[PDB]
PDB file of N, CA and C in Angstrom:
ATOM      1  N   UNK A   1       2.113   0.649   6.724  1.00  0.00           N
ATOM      2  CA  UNK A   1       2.087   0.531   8.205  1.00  0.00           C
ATOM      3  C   UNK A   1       2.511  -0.865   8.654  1.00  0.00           C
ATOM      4  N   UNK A   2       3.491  -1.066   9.852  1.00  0.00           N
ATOM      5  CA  UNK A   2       3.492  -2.125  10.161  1.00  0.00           C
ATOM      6  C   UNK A   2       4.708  -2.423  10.727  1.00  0.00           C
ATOM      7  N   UNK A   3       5.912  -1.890   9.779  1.00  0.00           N
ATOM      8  CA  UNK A   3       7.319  -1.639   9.658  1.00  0.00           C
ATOM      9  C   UNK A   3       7.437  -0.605  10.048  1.00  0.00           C
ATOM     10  N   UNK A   4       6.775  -0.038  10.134  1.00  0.00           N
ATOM     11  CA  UNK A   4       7.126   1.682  10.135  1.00  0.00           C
ATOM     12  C   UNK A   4       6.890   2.597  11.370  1.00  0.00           C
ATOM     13  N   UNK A   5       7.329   3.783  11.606  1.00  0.00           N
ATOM     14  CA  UNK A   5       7.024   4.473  12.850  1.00  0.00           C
ATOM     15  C   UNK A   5       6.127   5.779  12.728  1.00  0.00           C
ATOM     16  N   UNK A   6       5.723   6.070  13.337  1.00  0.00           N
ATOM     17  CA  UNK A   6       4.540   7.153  13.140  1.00  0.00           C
ATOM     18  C   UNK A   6       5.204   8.345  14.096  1.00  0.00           C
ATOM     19  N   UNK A   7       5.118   9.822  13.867  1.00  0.00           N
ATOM     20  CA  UNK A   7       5.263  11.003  14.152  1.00  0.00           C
ATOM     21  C   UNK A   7       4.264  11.816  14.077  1.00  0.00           C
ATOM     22  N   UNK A   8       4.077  12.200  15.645  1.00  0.00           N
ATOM     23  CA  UNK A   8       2.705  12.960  16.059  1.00  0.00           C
ATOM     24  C   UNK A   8       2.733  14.223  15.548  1.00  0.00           C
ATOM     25  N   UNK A   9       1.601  14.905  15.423  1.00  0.00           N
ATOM     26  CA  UNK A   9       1.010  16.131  14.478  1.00  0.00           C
ATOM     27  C   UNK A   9       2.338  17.507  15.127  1.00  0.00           C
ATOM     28  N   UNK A  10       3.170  17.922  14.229  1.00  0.00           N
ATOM     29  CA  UNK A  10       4.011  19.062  14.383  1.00  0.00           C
ATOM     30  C   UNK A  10       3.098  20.000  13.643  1.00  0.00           C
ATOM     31  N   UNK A  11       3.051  20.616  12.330  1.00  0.00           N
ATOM     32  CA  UNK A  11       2.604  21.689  11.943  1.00  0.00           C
ATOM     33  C   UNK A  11       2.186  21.298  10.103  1.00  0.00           C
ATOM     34  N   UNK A  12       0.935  21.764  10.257  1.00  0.00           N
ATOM     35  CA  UNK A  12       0.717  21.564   8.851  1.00  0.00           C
ATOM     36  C   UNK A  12       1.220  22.012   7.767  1.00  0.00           C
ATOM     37  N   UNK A  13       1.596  21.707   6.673  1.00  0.00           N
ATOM     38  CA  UNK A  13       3.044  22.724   5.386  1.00  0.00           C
ATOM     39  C   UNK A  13       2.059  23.302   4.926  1.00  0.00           C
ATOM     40  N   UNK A  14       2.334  24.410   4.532  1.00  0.00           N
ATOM     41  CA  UNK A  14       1.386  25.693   3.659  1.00  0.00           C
ATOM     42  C   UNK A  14       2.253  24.525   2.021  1.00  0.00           C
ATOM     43  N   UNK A  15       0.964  24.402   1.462  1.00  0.00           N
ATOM     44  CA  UNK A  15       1.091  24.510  -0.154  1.00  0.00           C
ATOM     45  C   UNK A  15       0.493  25.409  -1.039  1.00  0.00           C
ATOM     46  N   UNK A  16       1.283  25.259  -2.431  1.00  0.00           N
ATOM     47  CA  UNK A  16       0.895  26.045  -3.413  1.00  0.00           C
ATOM     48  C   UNK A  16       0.123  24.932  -4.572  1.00  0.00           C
ATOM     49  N   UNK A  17      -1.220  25.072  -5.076  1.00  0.00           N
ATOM     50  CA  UNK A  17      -1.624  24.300  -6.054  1.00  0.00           C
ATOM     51  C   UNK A  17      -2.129  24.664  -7.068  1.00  0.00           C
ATOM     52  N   UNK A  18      -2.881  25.495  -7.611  1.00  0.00           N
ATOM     53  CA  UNK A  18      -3.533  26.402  -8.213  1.00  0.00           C
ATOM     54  C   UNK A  18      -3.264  28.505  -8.004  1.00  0.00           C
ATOM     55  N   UNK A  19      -4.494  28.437  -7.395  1.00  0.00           N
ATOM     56  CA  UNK A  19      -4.518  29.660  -6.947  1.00  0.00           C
ATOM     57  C   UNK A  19      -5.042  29.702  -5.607  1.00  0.00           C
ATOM     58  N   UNK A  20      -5.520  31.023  -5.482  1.00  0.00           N
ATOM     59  CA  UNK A  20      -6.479  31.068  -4.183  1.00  0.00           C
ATOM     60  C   UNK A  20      -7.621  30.538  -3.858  1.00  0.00           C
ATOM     61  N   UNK A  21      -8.369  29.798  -5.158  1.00  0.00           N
ATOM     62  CA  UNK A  21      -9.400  28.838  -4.747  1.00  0.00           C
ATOM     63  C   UNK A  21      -8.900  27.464  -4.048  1.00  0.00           C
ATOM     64  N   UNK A  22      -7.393  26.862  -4.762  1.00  0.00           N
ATOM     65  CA  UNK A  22      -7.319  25.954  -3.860  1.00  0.00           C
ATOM     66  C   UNK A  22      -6.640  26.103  -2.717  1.00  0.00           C
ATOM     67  N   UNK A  23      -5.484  27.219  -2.707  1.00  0.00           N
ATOM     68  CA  UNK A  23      -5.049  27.618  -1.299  1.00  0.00           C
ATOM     69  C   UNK A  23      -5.952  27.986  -0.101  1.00  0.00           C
ATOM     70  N   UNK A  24      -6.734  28.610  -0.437  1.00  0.00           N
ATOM     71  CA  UNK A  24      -7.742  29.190   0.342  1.00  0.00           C
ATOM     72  C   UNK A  24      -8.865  27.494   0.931  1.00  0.00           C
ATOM     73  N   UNK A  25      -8.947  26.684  -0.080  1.00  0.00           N
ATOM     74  CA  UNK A  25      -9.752  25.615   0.117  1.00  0.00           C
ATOM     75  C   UNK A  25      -8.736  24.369   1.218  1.00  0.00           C
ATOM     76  N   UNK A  26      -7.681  23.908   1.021  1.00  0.00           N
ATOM     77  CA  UNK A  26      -6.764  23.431   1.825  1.00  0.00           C
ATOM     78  C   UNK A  26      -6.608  24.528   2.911  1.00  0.00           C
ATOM     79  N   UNK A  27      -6.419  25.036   3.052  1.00  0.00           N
ATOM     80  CA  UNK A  27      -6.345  26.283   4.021  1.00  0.00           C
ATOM     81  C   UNK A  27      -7.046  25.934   4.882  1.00  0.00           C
ATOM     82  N   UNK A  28      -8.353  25.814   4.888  1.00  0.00           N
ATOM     83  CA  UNK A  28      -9.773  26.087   5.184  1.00  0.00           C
ATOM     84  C   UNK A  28      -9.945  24.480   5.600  1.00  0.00           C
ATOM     85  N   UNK A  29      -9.633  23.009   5.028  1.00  0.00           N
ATOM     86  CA  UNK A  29      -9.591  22.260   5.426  1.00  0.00           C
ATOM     87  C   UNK A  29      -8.506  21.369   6.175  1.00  0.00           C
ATOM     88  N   UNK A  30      -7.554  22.318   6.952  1.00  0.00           N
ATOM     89  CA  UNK A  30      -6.344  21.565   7.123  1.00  0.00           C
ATOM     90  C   UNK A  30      -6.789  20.834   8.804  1.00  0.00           C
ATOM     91  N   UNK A  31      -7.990  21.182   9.117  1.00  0.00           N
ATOM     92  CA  UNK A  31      -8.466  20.649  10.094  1.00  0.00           C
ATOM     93  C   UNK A  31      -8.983  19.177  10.154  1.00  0.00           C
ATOM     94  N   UNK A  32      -9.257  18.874   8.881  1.00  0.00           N
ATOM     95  CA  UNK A  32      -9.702  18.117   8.344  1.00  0.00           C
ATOM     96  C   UNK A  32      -8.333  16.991   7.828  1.00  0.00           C
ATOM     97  N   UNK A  33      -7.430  17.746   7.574  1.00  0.00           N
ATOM     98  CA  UNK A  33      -6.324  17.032   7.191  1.00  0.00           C
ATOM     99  C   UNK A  33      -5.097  16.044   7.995  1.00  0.00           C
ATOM    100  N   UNK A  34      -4.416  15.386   7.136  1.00  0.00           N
ATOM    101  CA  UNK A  34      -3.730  14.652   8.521  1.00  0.00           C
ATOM    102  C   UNK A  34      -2.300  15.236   8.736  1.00  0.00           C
ATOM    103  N   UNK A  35      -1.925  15.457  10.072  1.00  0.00           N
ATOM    104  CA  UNK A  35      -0.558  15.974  10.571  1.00  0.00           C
ATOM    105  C   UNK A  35       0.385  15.222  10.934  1.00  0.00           C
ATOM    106  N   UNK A  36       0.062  13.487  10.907  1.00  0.00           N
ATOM    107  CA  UNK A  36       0.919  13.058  11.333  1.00  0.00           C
ATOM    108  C   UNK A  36       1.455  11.884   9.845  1.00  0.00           C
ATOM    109  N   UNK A  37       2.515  12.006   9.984  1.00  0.00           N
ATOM    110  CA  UNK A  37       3.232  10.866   8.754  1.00  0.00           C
ATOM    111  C   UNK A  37       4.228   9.757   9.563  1.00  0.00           C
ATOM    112  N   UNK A  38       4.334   8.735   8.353  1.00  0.00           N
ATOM    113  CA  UNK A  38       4.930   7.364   9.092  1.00  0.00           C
ATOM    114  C   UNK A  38       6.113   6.993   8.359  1.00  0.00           C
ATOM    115  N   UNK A  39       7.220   7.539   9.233  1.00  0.00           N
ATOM    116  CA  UNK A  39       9.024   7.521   8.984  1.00  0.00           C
ATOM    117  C   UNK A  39       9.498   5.846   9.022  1.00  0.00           C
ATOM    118  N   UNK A  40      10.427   5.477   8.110  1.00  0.00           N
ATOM    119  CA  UNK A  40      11.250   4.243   8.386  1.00  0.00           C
ATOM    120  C   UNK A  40      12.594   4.185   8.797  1.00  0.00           C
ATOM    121  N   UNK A  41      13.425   3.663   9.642  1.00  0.00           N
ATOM    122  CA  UNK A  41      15.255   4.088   9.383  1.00  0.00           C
ATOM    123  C   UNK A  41      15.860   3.870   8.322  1.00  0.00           C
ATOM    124  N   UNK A  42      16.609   4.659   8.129  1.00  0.00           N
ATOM    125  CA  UNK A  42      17.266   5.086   7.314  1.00  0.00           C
ATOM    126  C   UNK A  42      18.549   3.754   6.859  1.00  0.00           C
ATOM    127  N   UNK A  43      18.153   3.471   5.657  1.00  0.00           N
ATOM    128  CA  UNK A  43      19.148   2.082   5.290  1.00  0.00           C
ATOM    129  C   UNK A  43      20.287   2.498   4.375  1.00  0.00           C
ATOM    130  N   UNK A  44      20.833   1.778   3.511  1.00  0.00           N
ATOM    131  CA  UNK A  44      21.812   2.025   2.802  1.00  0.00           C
ATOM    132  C   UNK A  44      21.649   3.055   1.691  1.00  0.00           C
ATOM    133  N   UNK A  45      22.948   3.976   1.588  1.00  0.00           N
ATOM    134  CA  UNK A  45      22.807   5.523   1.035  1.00  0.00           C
ATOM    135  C   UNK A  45      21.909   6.195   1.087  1.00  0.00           C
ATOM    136  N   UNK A  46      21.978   6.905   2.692  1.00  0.00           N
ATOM    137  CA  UNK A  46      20.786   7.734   3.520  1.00  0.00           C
ATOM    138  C   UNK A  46      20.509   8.696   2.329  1.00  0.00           C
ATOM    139  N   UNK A  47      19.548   9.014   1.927  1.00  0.00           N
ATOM    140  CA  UNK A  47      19.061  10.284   1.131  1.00  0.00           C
ATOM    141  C   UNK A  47      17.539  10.589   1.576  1.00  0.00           C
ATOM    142  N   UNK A  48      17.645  11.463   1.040  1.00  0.00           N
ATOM    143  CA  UNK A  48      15.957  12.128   2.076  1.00  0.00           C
ATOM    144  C   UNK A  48      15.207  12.094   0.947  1.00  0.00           C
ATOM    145  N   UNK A  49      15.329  11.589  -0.737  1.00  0.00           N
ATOM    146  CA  UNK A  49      14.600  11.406  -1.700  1.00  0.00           C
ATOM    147  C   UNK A  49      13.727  10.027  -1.275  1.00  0.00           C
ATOM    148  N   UNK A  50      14.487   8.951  -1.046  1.00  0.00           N
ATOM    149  CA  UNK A  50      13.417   8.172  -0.362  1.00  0.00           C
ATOM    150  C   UNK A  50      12.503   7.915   0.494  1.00  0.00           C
ATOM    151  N   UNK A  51      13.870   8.284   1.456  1.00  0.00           N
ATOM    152  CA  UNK A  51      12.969   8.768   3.089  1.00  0.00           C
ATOM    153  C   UNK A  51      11.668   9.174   2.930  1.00  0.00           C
ATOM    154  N   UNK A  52      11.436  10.646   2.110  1.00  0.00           N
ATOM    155  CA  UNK A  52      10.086  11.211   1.974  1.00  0.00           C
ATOM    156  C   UNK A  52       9.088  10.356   1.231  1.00  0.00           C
ATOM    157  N   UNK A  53       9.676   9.585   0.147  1.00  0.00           N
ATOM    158  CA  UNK A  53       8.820   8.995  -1.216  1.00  0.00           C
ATOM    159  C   UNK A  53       8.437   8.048  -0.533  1.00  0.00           C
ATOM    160  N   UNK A  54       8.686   7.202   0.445  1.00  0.00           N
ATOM    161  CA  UNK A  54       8.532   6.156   0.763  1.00  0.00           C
ATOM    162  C   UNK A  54       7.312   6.528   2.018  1.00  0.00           C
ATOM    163  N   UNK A  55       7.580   7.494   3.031  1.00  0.00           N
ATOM    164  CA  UNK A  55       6.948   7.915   3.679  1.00  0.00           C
ATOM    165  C   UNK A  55       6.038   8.489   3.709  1.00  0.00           C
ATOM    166  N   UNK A  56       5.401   8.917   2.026  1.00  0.00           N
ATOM    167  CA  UNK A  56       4.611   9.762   1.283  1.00  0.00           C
ATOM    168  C   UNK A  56       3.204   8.786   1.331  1.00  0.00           C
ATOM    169  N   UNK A  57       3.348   7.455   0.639  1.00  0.00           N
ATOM    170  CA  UNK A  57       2.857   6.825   0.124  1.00  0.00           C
ATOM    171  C   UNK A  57       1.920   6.056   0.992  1.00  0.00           C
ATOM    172  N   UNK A  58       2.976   5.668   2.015  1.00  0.00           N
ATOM    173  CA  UNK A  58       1.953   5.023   4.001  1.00  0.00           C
ATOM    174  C   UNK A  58       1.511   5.705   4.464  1.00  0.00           C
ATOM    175  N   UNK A  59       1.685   6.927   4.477  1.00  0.00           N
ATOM    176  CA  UNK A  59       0.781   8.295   5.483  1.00  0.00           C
ATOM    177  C   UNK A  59      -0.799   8.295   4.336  1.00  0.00           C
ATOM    178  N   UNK A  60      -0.319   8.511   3.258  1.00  0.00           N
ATOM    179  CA  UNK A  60      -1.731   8.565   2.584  1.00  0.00           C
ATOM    180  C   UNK A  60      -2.593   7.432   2.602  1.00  0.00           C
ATOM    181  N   UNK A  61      -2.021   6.643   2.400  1.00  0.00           N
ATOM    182  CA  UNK A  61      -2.101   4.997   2.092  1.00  0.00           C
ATOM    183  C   UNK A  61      -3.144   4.680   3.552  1.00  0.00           C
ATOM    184  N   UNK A  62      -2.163   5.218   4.419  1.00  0.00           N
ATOM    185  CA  UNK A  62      -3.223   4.804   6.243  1.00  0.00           C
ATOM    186  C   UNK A  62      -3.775   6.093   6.635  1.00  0.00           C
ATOM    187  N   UNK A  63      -3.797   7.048   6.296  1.00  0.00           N
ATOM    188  CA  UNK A  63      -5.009   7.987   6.696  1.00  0.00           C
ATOM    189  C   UNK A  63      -6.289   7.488   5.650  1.00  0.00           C
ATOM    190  N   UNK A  64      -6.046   7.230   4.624  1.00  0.00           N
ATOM    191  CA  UNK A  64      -7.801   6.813   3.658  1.00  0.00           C
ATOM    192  C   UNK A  64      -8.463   6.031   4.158  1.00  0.00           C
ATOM    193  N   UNK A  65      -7.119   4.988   4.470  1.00  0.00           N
ATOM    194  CA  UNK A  65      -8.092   3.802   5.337  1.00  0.00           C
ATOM    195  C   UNK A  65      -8.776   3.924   7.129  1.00  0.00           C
ATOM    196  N   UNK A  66      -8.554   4.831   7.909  1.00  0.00           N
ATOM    197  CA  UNK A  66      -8.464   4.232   8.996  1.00  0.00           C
ATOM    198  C   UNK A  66      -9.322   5.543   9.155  1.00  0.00           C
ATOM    199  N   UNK A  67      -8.300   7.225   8.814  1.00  0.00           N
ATOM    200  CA  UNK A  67      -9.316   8.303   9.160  1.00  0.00           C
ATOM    201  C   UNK A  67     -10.825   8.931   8.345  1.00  0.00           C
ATOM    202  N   UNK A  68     -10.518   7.714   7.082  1.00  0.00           N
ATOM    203  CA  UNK A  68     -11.869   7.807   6.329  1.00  0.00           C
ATOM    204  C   UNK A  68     -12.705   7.183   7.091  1.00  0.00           C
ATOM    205  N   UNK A  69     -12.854   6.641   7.601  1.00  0.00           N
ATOM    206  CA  UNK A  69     -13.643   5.568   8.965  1.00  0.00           C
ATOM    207  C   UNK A  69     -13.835   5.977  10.221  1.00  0.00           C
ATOM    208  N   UNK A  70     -12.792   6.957  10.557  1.00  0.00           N
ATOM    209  CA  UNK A  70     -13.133   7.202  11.819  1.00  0.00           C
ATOM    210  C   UNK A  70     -13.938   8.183  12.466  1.00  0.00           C
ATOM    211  N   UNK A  71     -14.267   9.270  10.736  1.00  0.00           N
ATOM    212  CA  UNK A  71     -14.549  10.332  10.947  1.00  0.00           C
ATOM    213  C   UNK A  71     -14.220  11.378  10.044  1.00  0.00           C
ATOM    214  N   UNK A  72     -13.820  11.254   9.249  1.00  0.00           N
ATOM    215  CA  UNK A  72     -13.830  11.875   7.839  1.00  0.00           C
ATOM    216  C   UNK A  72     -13.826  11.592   5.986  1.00  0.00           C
ATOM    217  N   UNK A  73     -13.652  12.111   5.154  1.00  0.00           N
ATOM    218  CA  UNK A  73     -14.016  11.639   3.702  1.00  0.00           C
ATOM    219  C   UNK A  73     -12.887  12.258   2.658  1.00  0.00           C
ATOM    220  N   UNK A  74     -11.702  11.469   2.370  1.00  0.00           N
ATOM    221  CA  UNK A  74     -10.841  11.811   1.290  1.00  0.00           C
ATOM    222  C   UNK A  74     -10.886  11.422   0.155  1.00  0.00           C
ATOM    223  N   UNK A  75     -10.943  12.367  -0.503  1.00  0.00           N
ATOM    224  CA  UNK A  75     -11.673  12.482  -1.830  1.00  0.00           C
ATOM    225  C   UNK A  75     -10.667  12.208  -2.971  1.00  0.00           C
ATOM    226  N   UNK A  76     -10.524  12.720  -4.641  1.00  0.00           N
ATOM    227  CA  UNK A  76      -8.981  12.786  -5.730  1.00  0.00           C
ATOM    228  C   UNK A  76      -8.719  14.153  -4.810  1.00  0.00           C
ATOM    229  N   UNK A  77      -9.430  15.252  -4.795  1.00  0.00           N
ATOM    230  CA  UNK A  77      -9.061  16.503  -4.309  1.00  0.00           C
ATOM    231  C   UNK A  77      -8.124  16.345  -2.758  1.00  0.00           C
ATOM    232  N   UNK A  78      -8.384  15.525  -2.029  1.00  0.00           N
ATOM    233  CA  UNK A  78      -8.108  15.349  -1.150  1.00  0.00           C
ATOM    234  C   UNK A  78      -6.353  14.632  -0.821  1.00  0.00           C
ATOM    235  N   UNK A  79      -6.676  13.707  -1.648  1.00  0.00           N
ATOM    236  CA  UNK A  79      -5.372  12.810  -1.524  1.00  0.00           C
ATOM    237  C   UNK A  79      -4.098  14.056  -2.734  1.00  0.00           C
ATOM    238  N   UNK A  80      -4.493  14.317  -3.455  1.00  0.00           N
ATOM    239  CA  UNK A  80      -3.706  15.459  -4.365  1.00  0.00           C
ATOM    240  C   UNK A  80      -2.920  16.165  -3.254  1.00  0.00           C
ATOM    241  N   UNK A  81      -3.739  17.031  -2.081  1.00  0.00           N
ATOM    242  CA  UNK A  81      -3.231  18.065  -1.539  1.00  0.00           C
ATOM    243  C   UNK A  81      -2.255  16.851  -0.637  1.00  0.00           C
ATOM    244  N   UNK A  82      -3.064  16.055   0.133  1.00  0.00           N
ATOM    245  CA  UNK A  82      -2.342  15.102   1.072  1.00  0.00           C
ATOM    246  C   UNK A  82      -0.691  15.218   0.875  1.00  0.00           C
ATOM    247  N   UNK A  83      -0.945  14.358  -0.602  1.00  0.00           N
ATOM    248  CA  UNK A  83       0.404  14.315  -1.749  1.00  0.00           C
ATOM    249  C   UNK A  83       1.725  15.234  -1.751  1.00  0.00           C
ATOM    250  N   UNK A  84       1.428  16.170  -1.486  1.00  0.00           N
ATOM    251  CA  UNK A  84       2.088  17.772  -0.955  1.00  0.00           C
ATOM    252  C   UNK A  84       2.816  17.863   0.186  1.00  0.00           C
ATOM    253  N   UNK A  85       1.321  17.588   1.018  1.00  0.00           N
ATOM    254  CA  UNK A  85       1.470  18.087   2.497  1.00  0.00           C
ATOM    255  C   UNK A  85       2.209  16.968   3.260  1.00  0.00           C
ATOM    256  N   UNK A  86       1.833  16.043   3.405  1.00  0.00           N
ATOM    257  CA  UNK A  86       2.938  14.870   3.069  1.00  0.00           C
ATOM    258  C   UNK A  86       4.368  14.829   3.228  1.00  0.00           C
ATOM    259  N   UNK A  87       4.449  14.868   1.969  1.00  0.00           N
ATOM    260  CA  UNK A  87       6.051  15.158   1.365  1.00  0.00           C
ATOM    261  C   UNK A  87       7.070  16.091   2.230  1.00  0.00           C
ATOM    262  N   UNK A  88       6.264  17.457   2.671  1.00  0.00           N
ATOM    263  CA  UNK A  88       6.963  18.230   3.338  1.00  0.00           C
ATOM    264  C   UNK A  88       6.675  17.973   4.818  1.00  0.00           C
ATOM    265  N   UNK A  89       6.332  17.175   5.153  1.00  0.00           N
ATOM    266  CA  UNK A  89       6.537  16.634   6.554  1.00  0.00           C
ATOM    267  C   UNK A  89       7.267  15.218   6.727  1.00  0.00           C
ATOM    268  N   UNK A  90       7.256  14.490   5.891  1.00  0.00           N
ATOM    269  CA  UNK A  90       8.492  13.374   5.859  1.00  0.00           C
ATOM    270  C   UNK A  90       9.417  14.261   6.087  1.00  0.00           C
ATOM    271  N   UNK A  91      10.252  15.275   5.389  1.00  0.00           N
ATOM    272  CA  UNK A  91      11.181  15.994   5.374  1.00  0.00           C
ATOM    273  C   UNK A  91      11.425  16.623   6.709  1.00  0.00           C
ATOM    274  N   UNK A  92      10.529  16.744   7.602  1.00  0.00           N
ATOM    275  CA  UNK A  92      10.485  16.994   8.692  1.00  0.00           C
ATOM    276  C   UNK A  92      11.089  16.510   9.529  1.00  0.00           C
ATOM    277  N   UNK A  93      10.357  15.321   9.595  1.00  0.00           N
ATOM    278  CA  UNK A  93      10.950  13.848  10.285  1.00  0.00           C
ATOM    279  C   UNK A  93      12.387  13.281   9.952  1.00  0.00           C
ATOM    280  N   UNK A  94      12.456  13.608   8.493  1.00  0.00           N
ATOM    281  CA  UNK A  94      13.545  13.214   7.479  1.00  0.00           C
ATOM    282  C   UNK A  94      14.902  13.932   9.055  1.00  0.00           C
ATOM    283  N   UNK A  95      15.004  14.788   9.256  1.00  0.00           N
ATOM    284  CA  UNK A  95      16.036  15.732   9.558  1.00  0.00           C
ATOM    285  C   UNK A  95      15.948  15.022  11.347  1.00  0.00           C
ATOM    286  N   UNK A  96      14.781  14.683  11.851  1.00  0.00           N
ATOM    287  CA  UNK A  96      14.611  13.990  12.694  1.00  0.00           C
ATOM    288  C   UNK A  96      15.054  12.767  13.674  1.00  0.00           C
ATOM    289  N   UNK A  97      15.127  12.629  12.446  1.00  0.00           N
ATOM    290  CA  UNK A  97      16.058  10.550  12.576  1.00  0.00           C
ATOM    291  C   UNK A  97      17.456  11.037  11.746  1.00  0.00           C
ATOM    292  N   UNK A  98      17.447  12.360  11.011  1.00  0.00           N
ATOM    293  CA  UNK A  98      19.232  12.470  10.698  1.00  0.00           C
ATOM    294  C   UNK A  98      19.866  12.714  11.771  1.00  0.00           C
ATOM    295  N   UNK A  99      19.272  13.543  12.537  1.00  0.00           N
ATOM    296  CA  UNK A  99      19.719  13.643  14.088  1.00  0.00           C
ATOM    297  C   UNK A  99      20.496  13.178  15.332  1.00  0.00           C
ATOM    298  N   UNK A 100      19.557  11.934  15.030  1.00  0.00           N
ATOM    299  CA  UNK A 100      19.562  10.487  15.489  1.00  0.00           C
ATOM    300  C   UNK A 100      20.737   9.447  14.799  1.00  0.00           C
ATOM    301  N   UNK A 101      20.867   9.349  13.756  1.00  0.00           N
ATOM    302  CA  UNK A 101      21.729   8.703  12.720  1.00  0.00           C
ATOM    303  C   UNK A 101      22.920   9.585  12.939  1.00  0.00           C
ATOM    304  N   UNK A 102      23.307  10.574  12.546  1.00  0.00           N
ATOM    305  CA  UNK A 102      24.406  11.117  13.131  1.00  0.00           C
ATOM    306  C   UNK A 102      25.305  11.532  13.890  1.00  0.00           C
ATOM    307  N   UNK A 103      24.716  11.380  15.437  1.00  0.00           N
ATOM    308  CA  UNK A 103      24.786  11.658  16.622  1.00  0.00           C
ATOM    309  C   UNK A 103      25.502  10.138  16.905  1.00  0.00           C
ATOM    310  N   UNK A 104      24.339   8.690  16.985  1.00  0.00           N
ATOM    311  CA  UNK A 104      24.665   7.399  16.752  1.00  0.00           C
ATOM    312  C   UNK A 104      26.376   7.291  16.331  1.00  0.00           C
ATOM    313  N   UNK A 105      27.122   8.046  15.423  1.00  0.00           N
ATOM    314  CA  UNK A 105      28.093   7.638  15.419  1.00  0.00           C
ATOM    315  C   UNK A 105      28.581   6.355  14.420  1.00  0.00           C
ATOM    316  N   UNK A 106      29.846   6.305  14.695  1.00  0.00           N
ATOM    317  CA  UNK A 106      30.047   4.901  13.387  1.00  0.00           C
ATOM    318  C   UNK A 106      29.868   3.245  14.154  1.00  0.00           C
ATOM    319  N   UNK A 107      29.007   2.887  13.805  1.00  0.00           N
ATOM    320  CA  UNK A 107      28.215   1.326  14.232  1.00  0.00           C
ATOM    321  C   UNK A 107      27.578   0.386  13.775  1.00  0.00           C
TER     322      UNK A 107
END
């Protein structure tokens, strides 16, 4: 956080981790979970492998700290699913700011 930009809660990603004990358990806590992740612009040789990896790491990184405090408790179980859910919402954003970057033009 700091450098970075934050993107308000769109939709939580359905994951697969196990079985139906943990689908059903993320499922069941996505209320609990965080919807929003924190995008950077896009620098030299745009790829969405970073974009996400990079964006993976501050969303988890600042929900432990700030929403463990404010009102909830992330646990290994917790940050695992995060890890996931995460990932497929950078990708979100990822397409977001490609938008933006492409539209922008040559500059």
């Amino acid at each position: 956080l700091g450098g970075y930009m934050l993107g308000s809660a769109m939709s939580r990603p359905i994951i697969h981790f196990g079985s139906d004990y943990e689908d059903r358990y993320y499922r069941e806590n996505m209320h609990r979970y965080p919807n929003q992740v924190y995008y950077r612009p896009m620098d030299e040789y745009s790829n969405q492998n970073n974009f996400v990896h990079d964006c993976v790491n501050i969303t988890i990184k600042q929900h432990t700290v700030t929403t463990t405090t404010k009102g909830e408790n992330f646990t290994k179980t917790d940050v695992k699913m995060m890890e996931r859910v995460v990932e497929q919402m950078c990708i979100t954003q990822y397409e977001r700011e490609s938008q933006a970057y492409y539209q922008r033009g040559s500059s």
